[PDB]
Each structure stands twice: as C-alpha cells, then as structure tokens.
Amino acid sequence: MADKFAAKFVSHKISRTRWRPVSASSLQQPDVFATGSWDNEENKVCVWATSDFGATSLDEEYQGDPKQLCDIKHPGDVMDMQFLDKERIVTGSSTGTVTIFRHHENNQTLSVNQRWEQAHYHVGSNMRAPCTAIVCSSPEIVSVGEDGRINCFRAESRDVLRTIDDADSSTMHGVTFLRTTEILTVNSVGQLKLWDLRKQGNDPTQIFSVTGERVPLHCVDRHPNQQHVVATGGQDGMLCIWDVRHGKMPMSLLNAHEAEMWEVHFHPSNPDHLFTCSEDGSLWHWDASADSEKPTFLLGGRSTFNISRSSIAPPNANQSLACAWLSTDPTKGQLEITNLLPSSTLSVNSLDVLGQNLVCGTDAEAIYVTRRLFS
Amino acid sequence: LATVITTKESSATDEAWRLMISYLDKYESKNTLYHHCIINKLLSHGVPLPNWLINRYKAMDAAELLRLYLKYDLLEEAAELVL
C-alpha cells in the first residue's frame, strides 16, 4: 500500500498473471505484466504496471499499487497463455475461442488480431472444445483439455492442423514439453502418460506411476531451455524431476511440502530460480534447476541437491557414494527450501518472479509485489 | 550527418572524407578548383591523392590528371593512366 512491499486489493479473481517481456530482456527493468479476468463478468486481458522501489529506468513512484496501463476485450473466455513472442499473445478459452492479440511496443496498446470462433478444427469448421493449459514453443502451440483433448497450432501460420479428441480417464490439468514428437501429461491422482505426435484411437500408450507416495498432481511446467526438464507441484509433493526423457517408470521421488502447491514458476531471464507458492501463505525460492551444478542455497526437503567442488582430503581412505536403482529414493535434486514467509497470508493462488521482482495473486482477491533481496 | 554509426574503431579518415564530400556537395558539384587545391596541398605535403579521389576525377576527366602528374613528377602513374 504505502509502506514495505506493495499490497493492492484489486477485488477480482487472479487467474493467469504473467509478466510480459516488453520491459524484460532489455535495458529497461521489468514492471509491466498482464492479467486475465477469468471467473468474472467479462473475460478481459488487462495489461498493468507495478510500482517498484528506486528508479533505475523511469519506474513508477508512490510506494506500490499497480495501475492498469491498458486492457483488451473479446467475446471469448480466458484460461491461460504462454509468451511465445513479445508482441504475440495466444489465449485459449473453455468455449472454443482462441484469441491471438497483437501488442504494440511502440504504442503500449493492445489490438484484436485474430479471434478463432471456429478453433480446434482440422476436418471442417464450427468446433467448440474446452481448454485447460496452453503452452507454446518453437514452432508449435499445444493446448490440452480435461478429457485428453489435444490441439496443435503452428507458429508460422494462423490455422489449426491437429485436433485429437479421444476418451481418457481421470482429469488432466497442465502440460509440459519434451521434444517435437513426445508429450508428457500428468493426472489428478499421480499418473504420467506419454503420447506421441501420431496417436490414433483410444487407450493411452505408456502410463507410469511412482511407488510409495502418490498424491494428486496439480501444477506442472517445463523449462524454457531444455524441454525435458519438468517442474511439478501438487498436493503433498510428488514431482519427477529428470534431466532427460527416457526410461519407463520415473525413478525420481521428491516428496515435501504437505500444503497444496497451486503454481510453480521459473525465472524467465536466468532459468535457474524456481518460485513455489503454498496454500497457507508461503513463498519458497529454489536455486539451480537440476542441470545447473552450483552450491545449493540451503538444504530443506527430501532431495539429493547438487554436487560442487571438493578438496582437502585426509591421507586415509574416504568414499564417493555408490550406485543404486529404486523408485523410492530421489535421484535429481531441485527443492532448496528458503525460509521467507512461514505464515503471513491466509491463502495464495499464483506467483510469478522476474529479474528481481515477485508478484503474487492470492485467493482473497489481492496482489502483492515484493522486491527480492537474496540470490 | 551521422549516416554511418560512428565508433572509436575506424579512424577519422573516412569521417574527413565524408565531410569533404558533404562540403563539396553543399558548395558546387561542378567546380573542381577545390579538389585541385586539395590535391595540390596533399602533393606538397608528400602523399598522392586517395583512391576514391582518383576514381572520382578519373570518371570526371583524365587529361587534367595526366598533366598534373607530369607536373608533379608522377611519371609511372601518369604512364599507367594514359595507357
């Protein structure tokens, strides 16, 4: 509000809030973001700007309270979106209305480019299929639904050329990446399904689970660089972090945080800092996204962490671990618990970190903006 | 007018060349007395005229170049040019 970190009461559902690369990946500091207005009266994408401390690139004044720089309107709904380009933003809907908007950097405004009223088409037109998670990469944008419905769009043309509508069990919420011909989907119980680019008929291809602890998986995200790196956060913690994309059943088991994790975000600039939110009002910051071998920032959690340089050994006889294969002990480290906020907020929905600023939308219709001080 | 992005890598030779080009264009594109005085002072200093001056005045005339070379004792250059 007027002291310490920024706290605003926008009084609206904080669905999908993501920082745009307009003020990022440049000399300017990140401060401009976008928010979808899902579960409201009118699903509108609003571009806002926060107020950070100091002034390194003509930042906002006061002590906080973000302000809406612009807003766009569309008859479709708002689910989520993945920043494929700085000026292109593709948002899906649960009623089959894909909105591709054109953001002008030289104008700081939004223009309605494409509104696919007949999206998810491949053998005709006028098709309505709900969507749950839409993620983009080079050169395909993949959207998943609830009953296993998959939709694929190209980045070089404005058309849909792949719509697979099968009959799957349970419910799938989220989608990660692997390569140009593999898709890994998580279930709401603890199952992992591996599908190919050319799959016909019912019956999933490969289904795997984790022995021991099986909690409902919730949020799942992919690494912006290596696609085979997956960060998952569910109920009591059950992610299968792996630096590859082979093997049958996942040999990794990282069980921590009994509270339900609703979203786990990555650092877009330097993909080596993960930020995880808790349902009891907690924000954990993990370092070294598995592949990055560096000294860990404090332990915490049932994980193997990473190894660094070792020197100064006694003239006796030491050891250097061993080799074992089991589906119970962890294999890849990732969780680095950092005590930041034990219990301050009654509920927390989503969070997003960029450069040195973290936005956090809570379930009580509020937003918090905090400038990081650690590393 | 900074058409090409200036930098501390390239020396001031091209800068002076573009400056002379702009000055000649602002003054007169037909009068060659300025070029004459410039090349005369350069030869008095002790260095032949640059290659782009050579190309420009060769596309202009030729007999004047031959006469100036014969007067300034550039026998080999004048012989090659007349050949």
């Binding site: - | 992005i5 200036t6 930098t7 501390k8 890598e9």
Partner: protein, 365 residues
C-alpha cells in the same frame, strides 16, 4: 656521462693512470676537491624554505651528483683491482694501515676531505636517540652515509682500517649505532630502510670484531644491542669499548627499574608495519570476470619494478587496444568512462607500487 660510460670491463686503467700522471695535476685536483668540499650544501642559506626555488634546485642537483658519484664508486668497487674508489676517496690500499687513514682527518683545521665532510655532517647535533641533525635535515644523507659505510665494510681489506680509524678518532661507531630508533622521518618506508641499513652495518661490525677477537668491542656491541632503558653516553674503556653494566647499561640504574618498554628494538618493531602488502598488477571489475581474468593473464610480463606489472602508459594502451578490438559499430559516450577507468587503474597501480616498495623494505628488514 661517466656513470653511463663505466659499464664494461678493463677500462679503468686509463683513468687510474690519468688521475696520477702528474704530481702537479694531483695537487691541483686535491685543491679542487678541498674547495668543493668546503661548502656545497649549507643550511639556512642554501637549505631554506621561505626563499626562492633556486637554492632548492641547486641542492637537488648536488644531491643527484652525489648519488651518481656513489654509483660510480660502487660500480668501480664491484670489479677487480684496480678500482677508482681509492682514487676518489684519497686513501689507497697499497700503503700500510698506519698510513692509510691520515690522523689529521677529523680535527677541524686540516685539508678537507671525505672524512672531514663526514665528520662535519655527523658531528653537529645530538648523537643519541632520534639521530642528530642529519635526520632532521634530510634522511637521504644518513642513507647514503650508511650505504658508504656498508660498502667500505663489505671488503675484507677495507673493513679493518675504516672502523679502526672511526674508533680511534672520537668513537664514531657508538654515535652511529646510538641513532636507533629513528623518529625524525618523513615516511615509514624510509624510516625502516634506515633502521635496516644501520642494523646491517652494526651486525657487520660485530662480525668483524668477533673475527678479529675484540672482547671489549663485542661486549659494547652486545650491550648497545640488548639495552632497554635509554642509557647515557660514556667514555670509560677497559680495552677498546664498554665492558661493565654501569657505563653502557646505566639506564637501568638511572630509572631504578627495568621492563620491556622504551627499547630500541621494541620501538623498531612497533614502527615497522605488520600488515602484508600484496602487490597486484591489474585488477578489473566493470565487465565479465572471464574477460577480466583473460586480460590479467595476457598482461603478465616482467619490467623494472621486479613483479609482473607493466608501464603506467603501456598498460593503459594495452587496455585501450583490447577494448577497441572487441566492439561492433556503436561506440558513443564510452570515451569518458574509459578515461575514468584508466585513471582509477592508474591510481590502483600507484598504490600497489607503493605497497610493493613497503614489502621490499619489510623484506630487507
């Protein structure tokens, strides 16, 4: 010119012959030496601070001339016989010890020579703590005097008669050794340098006395070395110096107590620096650490200071060439930043050179 010429070998014979080719020429040279040593650097008149800069410039020129003369002397003494040191000092080595050092040198009424000048510059003042008047005037005079004494004592056939005459005159060794510790100085570097030189010449005198079996001299040296309380100058000699505890260690009886304070060696140790002076050639912190380490590894070559540092202008030229060879097309507003970085690096390497001189003085001590 003479110092730049005297750099080969087997050339000093010509000048040795031309120094004594004629008795009249030698007498005229001696008269000129007397006239030049009569007055060359007088206090107040020539050593002023409120008058003009002409006197200061003349004194600096005379000091540089003395530096070059001492350099020529040590360069001629470093080689084998013959040497120009004896010819320039006026006392050769072919004559016996009884006739080498003339007894008339140090009476203030005889032909002025090097010994007369040394007596005139080392007799005025207080020959006790904090040195006499030479340290108050210019410590470089005491520095060059200690250097000359060390160069004369390093030789086997020259250390004997020198200290013999110094002791038979007015006991100059005691007055020279009583200067510790030094207090009237302009820099701790010069202070510890003077302390190290005086300790070196005192140790070489102690070694020569122990080799020649001088019990009284060794006793006096050990007393002056292990003396704690500031004693008083005495003159009772049982054989050739101090031997009892009442004439050399009178400070204890004067203060009616004894401890570990106000001692010469203790004050020297408290004056010398304790921190380590690590000299760094080049250190940058404005770009990437990889490029910084690469530039540091590339700029590694010997010079004149003794370390892997470069010239004050050559390092900046190399840095300019390096930051110029790795560019693109846009380079506006970077020249003032580069100049500021060059100035900061120059100040840094100047401070590191000062630390290197401090470390060299500490290593000498």
């Amino acid at each position: 010119i003479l110092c730049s010429i005297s750099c080969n070998s087997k050339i000093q014979e010509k000048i040795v012959g031309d120094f004594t080719q004629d008795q009249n020429v030698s007498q005229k040279l001696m008269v000129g030496f007397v006239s030049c040593l009569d007055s060359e650097e007088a206090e107040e008149l020539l050593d002023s601070e409120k008058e003009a800069e002409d006197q200061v410039k003349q004194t600096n020129i005379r000091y540089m001339t003395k530096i070059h003369i001492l350099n020529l002397l040590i360069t001629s003494l470093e080689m084998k016989a013959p040497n120009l040191a004896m010819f320039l000092l006026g006392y050769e080595l072919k004559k016996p010890v009884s006739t080498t050092n003339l007894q008339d040198s140090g009476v203030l009424g005889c032909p002025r020579t090097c010994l007369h000048s040394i007596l005139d510059i080392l007799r005025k003042g207080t020959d006790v703590r904090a040195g006499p008047v030479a340290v108050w005037d210019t410590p470089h005079l005491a520095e060059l005097c200690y250097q000359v004494i060390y160069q004369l004592c390093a030789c086997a056939d020259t250390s004997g008669p020198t200290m013999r005459y110094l002791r038979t005159s007015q006991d100059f060794l005691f007055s020279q050794l009583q200067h510790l510790p030094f207090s009237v100085e302009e820099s701790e570097i010069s202070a510890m340098n003077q302390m190290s030189w005086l300790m070196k010449t005192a140790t070489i005198e102690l070694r020569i006395t122990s080799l020649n079996r001088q019990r009284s001299h060794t006793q006096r040296l050990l007393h002056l070395l292990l003396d704690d309380m500031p004693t008083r100058p005495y003159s009772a000699d049982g054989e050739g110096g101090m031997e009892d505890e009442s004439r050399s260690l009178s400070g204890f009886l004067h203060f009616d107590t004894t401890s570990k304070v106000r001692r010469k060696i203790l004050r020297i140790l408290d004056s010398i620096q304790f921190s380590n002076e690590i000299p760094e050639p080049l250190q940058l912190d404005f770009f990437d650490r990889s490029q910084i380490e690469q530039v540091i590894a590339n700029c590694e070559h010997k010079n004149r200071r003794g370390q892997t540092v470069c010239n004050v202008k050559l390092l900046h030229r190399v840095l300019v060439a390096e930051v110029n060879a790795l560019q693109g097309m846009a380079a506006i507003g970077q020249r003032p930043l580069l100049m500021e970085e060059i100035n900061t690096i120059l100040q840094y390497v100047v401070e590191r050179n000062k630390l290197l001189q401090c470390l060299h003085a500490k290593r000498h001590a």
